[PDB]
Amino acid sequence: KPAFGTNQEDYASYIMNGIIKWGDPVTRVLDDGELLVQQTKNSDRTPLVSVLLEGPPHSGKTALAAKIAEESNFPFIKICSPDKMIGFSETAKCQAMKKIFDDAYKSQLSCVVVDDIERLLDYVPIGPRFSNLVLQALLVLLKKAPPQGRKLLIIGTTSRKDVLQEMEMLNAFSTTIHVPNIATGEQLLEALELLGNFKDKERTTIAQQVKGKKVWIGIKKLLMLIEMSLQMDPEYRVRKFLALLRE
Amino acid sequence: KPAFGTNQEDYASYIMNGIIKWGDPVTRVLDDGELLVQQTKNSDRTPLVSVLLEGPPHSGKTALAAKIAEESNFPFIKICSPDKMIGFSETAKCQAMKKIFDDAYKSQLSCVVVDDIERLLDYVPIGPRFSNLVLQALLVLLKKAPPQGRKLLIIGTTSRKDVLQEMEMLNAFSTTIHVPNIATGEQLLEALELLGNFKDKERTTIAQQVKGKKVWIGIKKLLMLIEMSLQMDPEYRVRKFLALLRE
Amino acid sequence: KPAFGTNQEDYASYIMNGIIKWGDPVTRVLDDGELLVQQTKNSDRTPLVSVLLEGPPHSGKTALAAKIAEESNFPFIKICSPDKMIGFSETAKCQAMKKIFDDAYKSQLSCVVVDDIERLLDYVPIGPRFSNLVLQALLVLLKKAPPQGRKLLIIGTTSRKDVLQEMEMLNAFSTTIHVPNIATGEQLLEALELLGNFKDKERTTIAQQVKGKKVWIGIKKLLMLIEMSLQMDPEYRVRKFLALLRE
Amino acid sequence: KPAFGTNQEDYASYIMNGIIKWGDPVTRVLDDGELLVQQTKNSDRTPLVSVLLEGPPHSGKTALAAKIAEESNFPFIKICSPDKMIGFSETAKCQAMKKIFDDAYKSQLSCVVVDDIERLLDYVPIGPRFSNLVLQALLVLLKKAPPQGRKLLIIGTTSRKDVLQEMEMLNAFSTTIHVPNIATGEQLLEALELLGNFKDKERTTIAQQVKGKKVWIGIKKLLMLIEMSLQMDPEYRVRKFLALLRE
Amino acid sequence: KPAFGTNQEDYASYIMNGIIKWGDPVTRVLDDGELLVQQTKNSDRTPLVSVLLEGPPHSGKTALAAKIAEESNFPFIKICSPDKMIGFSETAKCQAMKKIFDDAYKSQLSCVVVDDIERLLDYVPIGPRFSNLVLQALLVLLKKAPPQGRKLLIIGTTSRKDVLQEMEMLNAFSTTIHVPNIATGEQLLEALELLGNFKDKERTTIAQQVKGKKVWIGIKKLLMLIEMSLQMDPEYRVRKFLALLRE
Amino acid sequence: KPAFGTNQEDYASYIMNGIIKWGDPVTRVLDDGELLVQQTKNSDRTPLVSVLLEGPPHSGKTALAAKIAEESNFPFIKICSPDKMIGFSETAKCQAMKKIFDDAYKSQLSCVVVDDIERLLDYVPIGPRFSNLVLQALLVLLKKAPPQGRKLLIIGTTSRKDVLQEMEMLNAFSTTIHVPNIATGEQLLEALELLGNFKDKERTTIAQQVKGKKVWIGIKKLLMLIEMSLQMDPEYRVRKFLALLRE
Ligand SMILES: Nc1ncnc2c1ncn2[C@@H]1O[C@H](COP(=O)(O)OP(=O)(O)OP(=O)(O)O)[C@@H](O)[C@H]1O
Ligand SMILES: Nc1ncnc2c1ncn2[C@@H]1O[C@H](COP(=O)(O)OP(=O)(O)OP(=O)(O)O)[C@@H](O)[C@H]1O
Ligand SMILES: Nc1ncnc2c1ncn2[C@@H]1O[C@H](COP(=O)(O)OP(=O)(O)OP(=O)(O)O)[C@@H](O)[C@H]1O
Ligand SMILES: Nc1ncnc2c1ncn2[C@@H]1O[C@H](COP(=O)(O)OP(=O)(O)OP(=O)(O)O)[C@@H](O)[C@H]1O
Ligand SMILES: Nc1ncnc2c1ncn2[C@@H]1O[C@H](COP(=O)(O)OP(=O)(O)OP(=O)(O)O)[C@@H](O)[C@H]1O
Ligand SMILES: Nc1ncnc2c1ncn2[C@@H]1O[C@H](COP(=O)(O)OP(=O)(O)OP(=O)(O)O)[C@@H](O)[C@H]1O
Ligand SMILES: [Mg+2]
Ligand SMILES: [Mg+2]
Ligand SMILES: [Mg+2]
Ligand SMILES: [Mg+2]
Ligand SMILES: [Mg+2]
Ligand SMILES: [Mg+2]
């Protein structure tokens, strides 16, 4: 248990492979986040600010949300994660979630990350089915101002903005930030360079196949394809990589 | 615990940014509310009066309901809010809600605000799903006259009048008051002036873009767009504001 | 707790604004009710008699049912009302309802009013949803003869005859009595006169606008429109009344 | 608690207005019932026999089932009625129902009446909804032979043969007996005569209006219409009767 | 409680009217069953063998399954029947069912009959509705090999092969055996002869009406029609029989 | 209970009839599995690797998953199987499943097999119905990295890749490996040879009927058809085999 009104998060587990600048959108996400941190800390009109980072799966939403939170330097920073509520009933999740906000309210400046909203709400498109009790708790928490004078920045992440819109959750968030997949051959080459896994000859081959072209892959997904490619004999790593990227 | 048959609400949390007269509808809402307060206090025929303030999200329904209640000067004034029932089961909400009315009945003149009906009922359009037990309790409470001779003004708020109509709740309310978003450039300029955030040169620029035109934004939403605009460098505040207002 | 096999109801709360003879249907309802009371008390063939008073909302069903019951002069008269089962689970309602009939069976002559069937059954058209356990208990209670020799008149009220028909409840009731809204300008003028709220000049103005015409408003609703009209300056009371009546 | 393996039912409550021979179908129902009683008592091949008496509501199903049971003269005769399970959960009903059969199995010759199957199963056409646990218990009980050598006649009644067919319950019953409403003016006149409520002049008038014609009314329903007619002044009893019969 | 790893079933209750050879399919069912018993006892590759006996209702599935089991002469033979789980919750059924298999696993050679799968699963076509917990337990039990070296023959019965297929249960059974209704006049005459209920003159009459023709009736159903026919006066037994067989 | 951070599985029960090389796909499955084991043990970027083995029912998914796990030689190897959760409620399954991963996290190198996902999730296509609580727990567990520095290979198996895709589970798995049924006469002949059940003359006959042709049968299913064929008289084994294979 941390000091009263404080909390230091373990960003290592949420950003295990860093934050590489593979393209302009990465900088845009971080800059927009810092502006929201600025607004939260300095505003009396809007002491409660919430933002939803959303994009396709594996695009890097969680790590970016954790980075924005980390850069806020707020006394209280906590990440509400589903991997800490495995098997939890609706009530159990609401109590756990409510506890986090209760502790946040004790700090003058706090930031709470509500990560992977779809999992927190136990959503599944078949039906669909989901925990309405948890959804309702979240809709209220997103609009509950901390006690007078104290500020709170809520950062949510999701790969299903569409579902959250149907649930009326978008009306609860102050704004949203799109977290895109790598979309161009250039951005893809930049990522590979910053990650440094292939030799120039290999990157050249890849480049010939992707430069000036369009791709669609999340940074987290790219990490896996690379690692799978590296298990091949040196002479087949590139072939494997392009094949995986292809299908 | 307050004195028997009494209760003083903390209006500061429900009206954190005041009540500015950005347009005629604001005065209309307050005046209609005072007439209902008058009817409640003076009538023997209709000792129970209920009104639903409804309009688009962020239009200022809660603050206006809290203001009408505050201006009643009734001995007992209580706001039934969902942010005090987070994670609550249907039964728990009904008991909490029933307690409030029970205490209200102890006063000769009382006013109860049932705020954000959609959240109180755990409503979600997917399904849809909602707490019928809570809906039923509310339908009965809306028609239950306080013990003989005592008066009660019930003020509800909602951003989903359509849903409440389907639930037959409109037949329970005595009347309804529409709470509109700011709808004209003039009303928008008036709001900015009363809030005093931009310089004349800036308001002039904005005016050139909105005067004699139509807009659609809730006062609560406007506060957020302004505050977000203020984080920009002086030379780009207006550009940001119009862009946000645009999309 | 009342004397064994007895119960005196508090008709004041169910008939707070009397029973005015605004039109022939009021007399028809009371007369049909007295005939059913007569049949119940005098018949050996049909010792159990049930009747459903139904009509549009606010038409005066409850007060009329309470009046019919009151005029029976039976030793045991009890009104089963939803405002005494707020927040109740299905089981809780069935037990409460079953208790009332159990006590009624102890009297030689009893009358039980099952008021606002839709609320007792927790009905909502979305779904729809309702308490089947309560519906089933009611279907059985409506056909359960008191112990040999004893009589029971069951009077139900509802604003949703259509729903009850779908639920097969109409096959349970012995007969039904329609409780209509005020339907003609004449009946409307008669009501205003018997209630005595407007001056002759005013009633004359209203008459010019409604006499020889058709209207559709429940007596309970009319009381509210009048009371709202009375909050206006003398010179605008009539204008307000007709406007409210209009929309 | 009755003697081991025995049970005497109170037929008075299930046949409060006797069994009048208003038409051939009444005799047909009783005769078919006695044949099934005969088969049950004398057969080694089919020691378990079940029959469903079904027809429109109010046609006299329960009283006829109770009469067939009474005429069996079996040591154990028990009527499983829903008015003894008001408010019961599915489990509670199954236990109560299972208890009855358990006691029946203790007798060499037993007869169990499962009355008003729709109510026992908590059926409602909206949905529809019903207690599947109770349905399943009944489907199994209908096919469970008493312990070797002992006989059991199960008599069910229902006004919804169609619903029971959908539930596959008809495959469980050995056979079914139709219990029709009074269908001809002759049968109607015979009923009135056997009940002796109108004077010859009156029956003559009625006859002129119904003889050689077709009608459709259950004996239980007829009893109520007559009794309602008898509340009128002598000169209007017939008019009332035909009017009620008409609509 | 029987000896460890053993269990002797009471086949009398499951085969109360024997196993008559009314036609070739009866022999086919028994022969196929003995081959499966042979495979189970002798195979190391498939120590777990399951078979579903299925056909129309009343065709004799249970008695035939009980006969196949009886003829296996296995040390452990147990019939899992729904008439021993009346009113049972899903969990209760799974525990009871799991207990049986647990005991079977203790024997070197065991046979478990899972009778009337539709009832075990609380199936009803309206909805439909059924116990998924029980279905899941059965799907797993059908594929769980007894502890190494021990054998188990599972025999299921059902009148709804179609439903079980939709539930994916057919992929769980090793094979299926069809249990048909009596289908020809010849088979029908053979049954009557083996049961010996009618006189030659009578069988001759029946023969004239059914020989060289097609019929469709389950042996269990035939037993009931015969027994019902025998309640008639000698001169009308045949007439009754053909009438019943007709409709 | 095994040593801290360790666990040795009993592969005998999951691979009771070995792993025969009936065709190239068998080698492909094992080779792809070893590459994933290699990646898991050697990578710092992707310390958590998950793979779904999927294909038609009876194709050999479980045994192959168990073989891949066995060949990893990891200190901790555990198979999460539904036959150890029979009758389990959603919560019970989640706790049991969560326990396994918790123990796995204690090892530097672990492999967890989540076998037969459809059964673990209590899936049934009618509805459909399934345990969402279990699905949600699995979606989170599939993405939860073991504590820093430790590796985990998760291997799932399913016969319903389509259902898992709808449930969004495919986005959770790192990759998938298809486990096909035997598809050619050649592969079928190879299987029979490796299993050694028929004589050359017999295999020759079969070959004449299947060589250069296409078939579709899972290895587990083939084992059963063979064993059933072996119960026939020597002269009819082949006839039986082809007949079974045919339909
Ligand atoms: N610019 C970047 N933005 C985000 N993540 C990055 C970046 N550069 C490297 N990474 C690494 O990529 C991974 C991103 O995975 P993360 O779990 O954040 O994705 P996600 O979109 O939240 O996934 P999911 O859709 O599964 O929720 C982390 O290992 C992170 O350190
Ligand atoms: N004229 C006004 N009417 C209402 N609110 C006003 C007005 N002028 C300023 N405000 C401020 O705007 C905010 C209105 O937000 P409020 O929560 O009342 O809106 P709402 O419509 O109830 O929101 P929601 O749709 O989220 O329920 C408060 O901060 C309030 O003080
Ligand atoms: N003739 C009348 N019949 C009925 N009520 C009357 C009559 N004259 C005056 N009233 C008054 O009108 C009101 C009728 O309201 P009541 O609650 O009975 O209506 P309702 O139709 O039962 O309402 P709801 O639809 O809300 O259930 C009572 O205050 C009653 O005293
Ligand atoms: N021939 C008859 N058959 C049946 N009931 C008769 C007959 N003659 C008179 N009665 C009387 O009519 C009434 C029949 O009502 P009963 O409750 O048996 O009908 P039901 O069809 O079971 O009703 P429900 O549809 O409500 O279940 C009883 O009072 C019974 O004594
Ligand atoms: N050849 C036969 N096969 C099966 N049952 C026979 C045969 N000959 C006589 N019988 C008798 O017929 C009856 C068959 O009924 P059983 O309960 O087995 O049928 P079922 O198809 O299982 O019924 P249900 O569809 O109700 O489950 C038993 O009394 C049995 O002894
Ligand atoms: N090459 C092989 N691959 C897989 N199983 C094999 C192979 N050769 C022989 N077998 C044997 O075939 C059986 C395969 O059955 P298994 O339970 O693994 O199949 P499955 O596809 O998982 O079944 P289900 O669809 O029922 O889940 C085992 O007995 C296994 O030892
Ligand atoms: Mg994420
Ligand atoms: Mg509000
Ligand atoms: Mg009423
Ligand atoms: Mg009946
Ligand atoms: Mg059977
Ligand atoms: Mg498997």
Q: Which domains does chain B have, with CATH numbers?
A: 1-180 (3.40.50.300), 181-247 (1.10.8.60)
Q: Between the CA of residue C177 and those of B80, C144, E246, what are the distances in Å? A: 39, 21, 49
Interior angle at CA C42, CA C41 and CA C47, nearest 5: 65
Which residue, among C30, D114, D130, has the nearest Cα to E122 in the 3D structure? D130
Which residues partner with A176 through β-bridges? A52
Cβ-defined contact of D83 to C140 (cutoff 8 Å): yes
> Which of A55, A77, A58, A18 lies closest to A164 in space, CA to CA?
A55
Residue A108 token pair: 């003058």
The Cα–Cα gap between E68 and E157 comes to 12
CB contact set of C240 (below 8 Å; sequence gap of 6+): C228, C229, C232
Q: How far is CA A112 from CA A76, A78, A97, A177, B3, in A?
A: 8, 5, 10, 16, 38
Question: Residue E227 — left, alpha, or beta (φ > 0 → left; ψ -120 to 50 → alpha)?
Answer: alpha
* Widest Cα–Cα separation across chain C: 64
Distance CA A62, CA A79 (A): 10
C-beta atoms of A126 and F43 within 8 A? no
B207-245: string of b/e by CB count within 10 Å (b at 16+)? Answer: beebeeeeeebbbbbbbbbbbbbbbeeeeebbebbbebb
Question: Cα–Cα distance between D182 and D176 in angstroms, integer?
Answer: 19
Please report, as a single letter, which amino acid is at residue E131.
S
For residues B236 and B239, what is the distance between their CA atoms, to the nearest angstrom?
5
Cβ neighbours for A71, distance < 8 A, ≥ 6 positions apart: A30, A33, A34, A37
Alpha carbon distance A220, B191 (integer Å):
46
Atom from ligand 2 closest to the CA of residue B191: 8
Q: Among the residues of chain D, which ranges form H helices?
A: 24-42, 61-72, 90-105, 117-120, 132-141, 161-166, 185-195, 200-210, 219-229, 237-246
Resolution (A): 1.9
- Contact between residue E96 and residue E137 where contact means Cβ atoms under 8 Å apart: no
Name the minimum distance, in Å, from the CA of F69 to any CA of chain A. 18
Annotated binding-site ranges of C for ATP: 17-22, 57-64
Three-class SS of residue F157? strand
d(C-alpha C87, C-alpha C68), whole Å: 29
Taking Cα atoms as reference points, which of E203, E177, E233 lies closest to residue E60?
A: E177
Q: E100, E78 in Cβ contact below 8 A?
A: yes
Residue B37: Cβ-neighbour burial (10 angstroms; 0-12, 13-18, 19+): buried
Whether chains D and F touch (3+ CB pairs under 8 A) is answered by no
Q: What SS3 class is residue F154?
A: strand
Is E116:E13 a contact under the CB 8 Å cutoff? no
D193: tokens are 């005569």
> Cβ(E102)–Cβ(E110) under 8 Å?
no
- Atom index in ligand 6 nearest the CA of residue F55 equals 21
- Edge to edge, the sheet with strand E76-80 lists E76-80, E109-114, E151-158, E48-54, E175-178
User: In Å, how far from its chain's centre is CA A171?
Assistant: 20
Question: How many whole angstroms from E63 Cα to the centroid of ligand 11?
Answer: 7
- Residues with Cβ within 8 Å of B39's Cβ and at least 6 positions away in sequence, in order, are B46, B49, C227, C228, C230, C231
Residue D213 buriedness (CB in 10 A; 0-12 / 13-18 / 19+) = exposed
Based on the number of CB atoms within 10 Å of its own CB, is F210 exposed (0-12), middle (13-18) or buried (19 or more)? buried
Q: Please judge whether B87 and A137 are an interchain contact, meaning their C-beta atoms are less than 8 angstroms apart.
A: yes
Phi, psi at F73, each rounded to 5°: 60, 20
* Residue E94 near chain F (CB below 8 Å): yes
> Of D87, D113, D124, D14, whose CA–CA distance to C102 is shortest?
D87
Report chain A's C-alpha Rg in angstroms: 20
Residue where the block lists tokens 């059964």: F119
Q: How far apart are the first and last CA of chain A?
A: 47
Residues E228, E205: Cα–Cα separation, whole Å = 18
C-alpha–C-alpha distance, residues E245 and F11, integer Å = 58
Q: Which residues of C touch D87 (CB under 8 A)?
A: 91, 94-95, 98, 133, 137
The partner residue sitting opposite F231, judged by closest CB among E35, E137, E143, is: E35
CB atoms within 10 A of CB A17: 14
Cα A183–A184–A188 angle (5° rounding)? 95
Contact B9, B77 (CB under 8 A): yes
Alpha carbon E186 to chain centroid, angstroms: 23
The secondary structure of residue C122, as a DSSP letter, is T
Cα(A131) to centroid(ligand 1), Å = 26
B52: Cβ contacts below 8 Å, ≥ 6 apart: B117, B155, B156, B157, B158, B161, B164, B169, B170, B173, B175, B176, B177
Which residue, chain included where needed, has tokens 């649930």? A167
Residue to substitute in E62, E160, E190, E216 for testing ligand 5 pocket (most ligand atoms within 8 angstroms of CB): E62
Q: Which of C118, C201, F224, F177 is nearest to B172 (CA)?
A: C118
Cβ distance E56 to E152 under 8 Å?
A: no
What long-range pairs does C124-129 form, CB within 8 A, spacing at least 24? C124/B132, C124/B135, C124/B136, C124/B167, C124/B168, C125/B166, C125/B167, C125/B168, C125/C163, C126/B128, C126/B130, C126/B166, C126/B167, C128/C163, C128/D126, C129/B132
Other Cβ atoms less than 10 A from the Cβ of B108: the count is 14
Is B227 within 8 Å of A143 when comparing Cβ atoms? no
Q: Among A86, A123, A229, which would you mutate to test the F interface (most chain F Cβ atoms within 10 Å of its Cβ)?
A: A86
- Closest CA relative to residue A76, chosen from A156, A162, A154: A154
d(CA B162, CA F205): 74
Sheet holding A48-54, edge to edge: A76-80, A109-114, A151-158, A48-54, A175-178
Residues C82 and C100: their CA atoms lie apart, in Å, by 13
User: Greatest CA span in chain E, whole angstroms?
Assistant: 64
Instruction: Give the chains touching D; criterion: ≥3 Cβ pairs < 8 Å.
Output: C, E
User: Which ligand gives the minimal distance to the CA of C190?
Assistant: 3
| Nearest-neighbour CA in chain F from A161: distance (Å) | 15
3-state secondary structure at position B233: coil
In sequence order, the 6+-apart residues with CB closer than 8 A to the CB of D107 are D5, D6, D7, D74, D75, D76, D150
Query: Which technique?
Result: X-ray
Among all bound ligands, the one having the nearest atom to the CA of B187 is 2
| N- to C-terminal Cα separation, chain D | 47
The answer to whether the beta carbons of residues E110 and E76 sit under 8 Å apart is yes
Query: φ, ψ for residue A246 (rounded to 5)?
Result: -65, -50
Q: At residue E144, what is the residue type?
A: K
Torsion of CA A37, A38, A41, A44, to 10 degrees: -120
Which value, in Å, is the radius of gyration of the alpha carbons in chain E?
20
CB-based pocket (< 6 A), ligand 1: A 15-20, 22, 26, 57-64, 116, 157, 159, 218-220, 223; F 143
Tokens of C13: 């709360």
CA pair distance F158, F153, nearest whole angstrom: 17
**What is the SS3 assignment for chain A?**
CCCCCCECCCCCCCCCCCCCCCCHHHHHHHHHHHHHHHHHHHCCCCCEEEEEEECCCCCCHHHHHHHHHHHHCCCEEEEECHHHCCCCCHHHHHHHHHHHHHHHHCCCEEEEEECCHHHHCCCECCCCECCHHHHHHHHHHCCCCCCCCCEEEEEEEECCHHHHHHCCHHHCCCEEEECCCEEEHHHHHHHHHHHCCCCHHHHHHHHHHHCCCEEEECHHHHHHHHHHHCCCCHHHHHHHHHHHHHC
**Is C166 an 8 Å CB contact of chain D?**
yes
First-residue to last-residue Cα distance in chain C: 47
Return the closest-CA partner of residue B204 out of B189, B216, B191, B215.
B189
Do the chains contact at E130 and F126, CB–CB below 8 Å? yes
- In the three-class reduction of DSSP (H, G, I as helix; E, B as strand; rest coil), residue D34 is classed as helix
Q: What CA–CA distance (Å, rounded) separates C131 from C135?
A: 6
Torsion of CA F12, F15, F16, F18, to 10 degrees: -120
**Which residue, F98, F114, F97, F110, is CA-closest to F5?**
F110
Q: Tell me how crowded residue F162 is: count the other CB atoms within 10 A of its CB.
A: 11
Q: Cβ atoms within 10 A of the Cβ of D196, count?
A: 8
Q: Map tokens 């035909």 to a residue.
A: D242
Neighbours of C18 (CB within 10 A): 9
Any residues with CB less than 8 A from the CB of A98 and at least 6 apart, and which? A137, A141, B86, B87
β-strand C214-217 against C182-184: which pairing, if any? Answer: antiparallel
Is the separation of the CB atoms in E52 and E164 below 8 Å?
yes
Ligand-binding annotation for B61, yes or no, is: yes
Q: Contact E114/F102 with Cβ under 8 angstroms?
A: no
Tally DSSP H helices, then E strands, for chain F: 10, 7
Phi, psi at residue C46, to the nearest 5°? -125, 75
Instruction: Provide the token pair at B124.
Output: 């979600």
Chain A residue with the nearest C-alpha to that of B123:
A136
What are the residues whose beta carbons fall under 8 Å from the beta carbon of B176, sequence distance 6 or more? B51, B52, B53, B54, B161, B170
Report the C-alpha gap between A32 and D76 in whole angstroms: 83
